[PDB]
Amino acid sequence: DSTGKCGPPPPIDNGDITSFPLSVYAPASSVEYQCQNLYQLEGNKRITCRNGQWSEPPKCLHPCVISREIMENYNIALRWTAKQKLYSRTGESVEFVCKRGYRLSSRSHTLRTTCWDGKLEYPTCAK
Amino acid sequence: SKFTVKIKNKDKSGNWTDLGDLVVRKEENGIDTGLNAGGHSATFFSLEEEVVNNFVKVMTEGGSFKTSLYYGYKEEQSVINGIQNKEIITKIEKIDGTEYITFSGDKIKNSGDKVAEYAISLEELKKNL
Amino acid sequence: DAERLKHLIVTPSGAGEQNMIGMTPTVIAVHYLDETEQWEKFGLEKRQGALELIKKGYTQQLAFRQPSSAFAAFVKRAPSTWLTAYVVKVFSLAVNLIAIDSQVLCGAVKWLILEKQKPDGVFQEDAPVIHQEMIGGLRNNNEKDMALTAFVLISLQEAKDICEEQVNSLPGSITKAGDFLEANYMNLQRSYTVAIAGYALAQMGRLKGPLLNKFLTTAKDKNRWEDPGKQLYNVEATSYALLALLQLKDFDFVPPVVRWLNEQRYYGGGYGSTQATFMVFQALAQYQKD
C-alpha cells in the first residue's frame, strides 16, 4: 500500500519476536511472535509491514496459577492430583473437592472450572 | 481402589504424542476417571456400577461401553460441560511394536469434523484391572 | 593468589557439559587477574595462550548449541535449563575477554524466557544435567524453585546490558522472576537460597526492608552464609551474598565477608568445583573493582 518502512515491531506482553529486532523494516517484511511457556497466542503470529505500519500484533492469553494458598483459603483441594501448585493453560479444566470437614457453599457445577485468560472461577466451601 | 495409567493422544499433525496420565478411581456409584495433563486436572469420564465389569473387559480386549458423563481433553466440546450417555469404542493398536488401547472421544470444537483419539497401554490396563 | 591459580588455566574438552566445566576456570581466571591487575605476579605471555583456550572453549561449546539456541550435553539430548543459563552466565563475562556472538548469547536468553519461564516467574528444569557436580549448591532438592529462579535470573541480569536491545521481553521476564523471589523470600530456610536470591533481588534493587533484614540476619558471625553440608556450597553461598552486599553498596558489612573467603584458602579447581571456582573469583574480582 506504500513504500513506507516500519520501525521495530510492537512489543507484546508475555511474548516476543522469533527473530532479532532490526531498527528499520522494508515494506512487505514480516516478523513472527511466540508467547511465553503456557500463554496462548490469540491472533496472528505473523505481522506484515504494509503501508509503513505493522499489522495488529497478537495477545498472550494468560494461564491460571492454582496455588495451595488459594485452595486453603476457599477450603478446597485438587481432586485428581497430590500437587499443591498447578499451571492450567487457557482452556484447560480443573476439578476440586471440599477439603475434609467442609461443605460446598457455591453452586454444584462450580467444583469443575475452566481456565480463561488467567481467570479460573474457584468454588467456595464452609463449615 | 485407585490407580494411574500413562496416556498418549493424536495431536494436530496426527502423530501419537504423550498427553499425561489417567487416574482411574473406583467410587460408590461406578468408576470416575480423571485426566492429569499438565495444568489440566479434572474428570475425563464417569461410569455407573452396572458398566464396571463391561468397562474392565472393553479396556483390556476391545469393544464398546456407555459412560454416564464424558469430558475429554481441552480440544473437545464435551470438556467444559460434558456430554451424557457417550460411547467409548476401543481397539488394540501397535505403536513402535508396543500394544495400546486406542479410542475415539469427541469432535475438535470448531473444525471440519475430526474427533480426538487417545491411547492407553494394554499391559498397564491388565496390571491394574 | 595468582601463583596458586596456575591450575585454573585448563584446556576445555568433552561434550556440552564437560566443555563448560573445563571452560569455567580459564575464563574466571583471566577475568579475576584482569580486574586484580595481578598479571605482574603471573606474566604476559600466558594471557594470549589463555585467551586461545577461551576461544577454543567457546568454539567447542558452539557444537552443542541446538536449533532452539539452547544447550544440552549432546545435540540429541533434551535441553538443560540450568546449562543454558550457565552458558549465558559464563559467556556474559567472556564478552569482554574474547569475541562472543551476541546472537548466540541473546538466543539462549530468549529461549530461557519463551520456553523455560513459568507464569509466576519460576524457571523450571525439564532435562537435568548429567554432571550434577557442576550445579553446586543447587543439588539440594529443598527450595529448588527459589534457588533455580534466582540462578537463571542472575544469568539474565548479567546478560541484560548486551541483550537489552535484542530481547524486548527481557525486562518483563526479569520482573516476573523477581516478583516470585520477592514473594517467597521471607519463608526461606537455607542460607544458600537467602544468599543466591539475595543477589538476584539486590541486582533489581528489590532486596529492601524485611527481605534485606532477613538476608543480613542469616549471616553467621556477620561474615559467612552457611548451611551444614559440603563446604564448597558454603563458599559459593557467601560469594553470591558478597556480590549482593556490593550491589547494596554496604561497605560496612563487606570486609568480614571478604576476610572469611580469603581465610577459606579456596583457589578453585577439582571435581564439583565449577560453581565455587566461578563464584568466588567473580565476587572477589568485583570486590577489588569497588
Side-chain angles (χ1 to χ4, degrees), chain A, chain B residues 1-11 13-56 58-65 67-93 95-113 115-121 123-129, chain C residues 1-2 4-5 7-36 38-39 42-43 49-290:
Chain A
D1 276 28
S2 119
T3 83
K5 286 165 208 296
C6 302
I12 65 153
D13 284 24
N14 314 291
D16 211 340
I17 58 162
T18 64
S19 59
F20 288 95
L22 311 161
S23 36
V24 160
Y25 286 83
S29 69
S30 56
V31 286
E32 197 177 292
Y33 287 97
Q34 206 209 297
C35 285
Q36 287 196 267
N37 197 225
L38 301 137
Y39 289 82
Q40 195 149 291
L41 191 137
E42 185 192 84
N44 219 307
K45 64 164 161 182
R46 179 207 178 274
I47 61 151
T48 187
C49 159
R50 82 168 310 187
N51 189 357
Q53 288 195 305
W54 287 112
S55 312
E56 207 48 18
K59 268 190 173 200
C60 293
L61 297 178
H62 281 267
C64 305
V65 67
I66 307 118
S67 52
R68 79 164 279 266
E69 268 186 71
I70 297 173
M71 285 180 283
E72 283 281 295
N73 283 307
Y74 274 108
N75 289 317
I76 63 174
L78 276 163
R79 172 169 146 107
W80 295 99
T81 186
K83 298 189 241 175
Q84 289 175 334
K85 185 161 71 184
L86 209 79
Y87 300 119
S88 308
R89 287 186 60 111
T90 279
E92 297 190 327
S93 300
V94 167
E95 203 173 275
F96 301 100
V97 281
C98 280
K99 193 179 69 190
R100 196 170 170 96
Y102 307 88
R103 289 220 214 186
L104 186 80
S105 212
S106 51
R107 305 187 189 183
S108 261
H109 73 277
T110 76
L111 273 159
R112 204 176 179 289
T113 304
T114 301
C115 176
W116 275 117
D117 192 32
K119 294 176 255 316
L120 179 123
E121 184 181 342
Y122 303 86
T124 63
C125 306
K127 187 55 180 198
Chain B
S1 181
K2 164 196 170 173
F3 71 87
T4 315
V5 280
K6 287 167 208 165
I7 191 166
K8 297 161 169 279
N9 74 331
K10 271 191 169 178
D11 59 6
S13 187
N15 303 309
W16 288 112
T17 316
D18 286 338
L19 174 66
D21 323 312
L22 183 73
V23 176
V24 182
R25 273 178 197 197
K26 295 100 193 208
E27 286 212 312
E28 288 317 297
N29 207 343
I31 287 148
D32 299 335
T33 208
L35 164 72
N36 284 324
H40 182 305
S41 169
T43 307
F44 194 69
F45 62 73
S46 50
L47 295 141
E48 299 287 330
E49 284 168 276
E50 337 279 339
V51 203
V52 169
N53 286 321
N54 187 36
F55 166 81
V56 171
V58 165
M59 299 272 70
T60 53
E61 290 183 312
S64 190
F65 64 90
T67 46
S68 78
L69 269 90
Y70 176 83
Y71 296 99
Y73 195 51
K74 77 194 212 197
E75 312 300 42
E76 330 210 284
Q77 210 107 42
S78 46
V79 64
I80 295 149
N81 275 69
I83 305 169
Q84 295 171 299
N85 306 64
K86 275 236 155 172
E87 262 207 300
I88 284 93
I89 318 129
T90 66
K91 49 191 158 163
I92 305 174
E93 283 193 20
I95 299 163
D96 300 22
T98 306
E99 309 238 296
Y100 292 100
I101 289 281
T102 304
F103 59 96
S104 50
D106 185 42
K107 200 205 162 306
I108 308 268
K109 283 283 181 179
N110 282 1
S111 278
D113 213 330
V115 301
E117 279 197 294
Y118 316 92
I120 38 170
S121 183
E123 295 197 332
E124 319 319 312
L125 283 155
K126 283 197 263 77
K127 274 184 191 181
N128 298 98
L129 295 155
Chain C
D1 34 310
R4 334 268 178 71
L5 305 216
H7 67 283
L8 300 175
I9 304 149
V10 281
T11 159
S13 71
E17 302 171 12
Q18 250 299 327
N19 180 69
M20 282 317 281
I21 304 165
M23 194 178 164
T24 302
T26 319
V27 189
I28 203 75
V30 172
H31 169 84
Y32 182 70
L33 299 174
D34 279 22
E35 318 296 321
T36 194
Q38 259 224 107
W39 283 103
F42 203 123
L51 287 158
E52 284 326 304
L53 288 180
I54 305 167
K55 281 171 186 192
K56 263 160 218 159
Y58 167 73
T59 297
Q60 281 167 151
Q61 196 52 213
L62 283 173
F64 304 96
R65 177 167 203 256
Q66 307 192 340
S68 49
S69 305
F71 297 80
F74 323 104
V75 208
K76 286 268 183 160
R77 202 192 152 88
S80 157
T81 307
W82 191 86
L83 183 69
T84 308
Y86 191 55
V87 170
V88 174
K89 201 196 219 305
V90 174
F91 287 22
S92 291
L93 276 191
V95 300
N96 309 304
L97 313 182
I98 67 138
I100 307 284
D101 185 5
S102 54
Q103 296 181 294
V104 163
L105 190 113
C106 307
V109 169
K110 206 199 266 168
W111 181 81
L112 291 160
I113 301 157
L114 297 174
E115 306 283 344
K116 298 297 158 192
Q117 190 176 42
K118 291 291 151 170
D120 60 346
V122 173
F123 275 101
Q124 203 170 273
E125 172 67 271
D126 297 308
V129 288
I130 300 170
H131 297 251
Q132 296 281 298
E133 67 266 8
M134 77 185 290
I135 75 166
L138 266 128
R139 232 182 153 157
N140 161 102
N141 204 4
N142 183 9
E143 284 145 35
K144 208 183 120 203
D145 291 342
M146 279 295 283
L148 188 67
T149 300
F151 173 79
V152 184
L153 180 55
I154 285 153
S155 299
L156 303 190
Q157 295 190 276
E158 305 287 13
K160 192 177 86 131
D161 299 306
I162 308 121
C163 297
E164 250 175 324
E165 304 295 323
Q166 293 157 64
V167 202
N168 298 338
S169 60
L170 186 54
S173 183
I174 291 164
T175 292
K176 211 146 84 177
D179 296 337
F180 179 75
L181 300 180
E182 208 210 312
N184 309 258
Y185 195 86
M186 289 297 280
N187 298 298
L188 287 182
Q189 292 225 316
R190 295 195 15 122
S191 282
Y192 179 87
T193 342
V194 153
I196 194 160
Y199 177 48
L201 287 158
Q203 281 185 298
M204 300 180 72
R206 290 221 221 161
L207 192 77
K208 286 178 154 74
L211 267 72
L212 181 50
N213 182 46
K214 183 176 184 73
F215 170 77
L216 303 161
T217 70
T218 301
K220 292 176 199 170
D221 305 333
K222 289 176 159 182
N223 67 332
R224 63 183 190 270
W225 273 258
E226 57 153 50
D227 298 290
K230 295 194 197 173
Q231 202 56 47
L232 278 158
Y233 294 2
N234 301 332
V235 173
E236 189 203 338
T238 305
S239 296
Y240 277 114
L242 171 62
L243 277 177
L245 291 168
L246 299 155
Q247 204 83 21
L248 298 150
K249 307 178 171 78
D250 191 333
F251 308 116
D252 301 73
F253 209 106
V254 159
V257 174
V258 182
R259 307 197 206 101
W260 186 81
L261 292 158
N262 300 134
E263 247 127 36
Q264 291 319 288
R265 288 180 272 216
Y266 195 64
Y267 312 120
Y271 171 90
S273 78
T274 321
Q275 297 297 281
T277 307
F278 190 102
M279 285 320 300
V280 82
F281 293 97
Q282 198 211 331
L284 286 155
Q286 189 60 45
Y287 161 73
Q288 282 146 24
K289 232 175 295 176
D290 305 9

